[PDB]
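User: Predict the structure for this protein chain, please.
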Amino acid sequence: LAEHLLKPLPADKQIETGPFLEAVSHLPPFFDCLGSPVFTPIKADISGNITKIKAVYDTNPAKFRTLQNILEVEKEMYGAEWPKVGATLALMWLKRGLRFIQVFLQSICDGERDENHPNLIRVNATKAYEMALKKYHGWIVQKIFQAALYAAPYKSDFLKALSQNVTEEECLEKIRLFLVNYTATIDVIYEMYTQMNAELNYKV
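Assistant: Here is the predicted structure, written as structure tokens:
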């Protein structure tokens, strides 16, 4: 996780597309090590969106140099169907998966727990869900998330699975290091969606 740090934001806060895609491509693999087939479609959703944005970038790397460039080019290129089209739409859903991961990891690092059930991660995952995804899901997918939640590993096991023979405390400090530029980048992407009026609130 500290092997594939995101770059810091440059001074103009424009995120280069190519390095962003390379960086977040390291995230989906972690899903194969959570110990459950329940995670397979989740991995596919995030990976799928990365692939869709990459395929749009690959057509013209210079025109799509930055994430901002993607949104503004597609707005011009598509007309009325935008922002519900192309790499803009894929990144809109990608950012919510990335924010989910962010809120979950930060919650774990901040020592948030259920006193009653201390070695579970259900409260951390639930907070992350509420903050990033829930309002974009209809009732059925919410019900599926609730069920899926029970495939979650124990906290102790989750942390050991992300790690080297290293203490839990060491592993968390490494996660905190990863979260610095990760959080800043996602925040800038959310801000970009707001400024460009590209955010949509349809539920699935």
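The longest helix spans residues 168-195.
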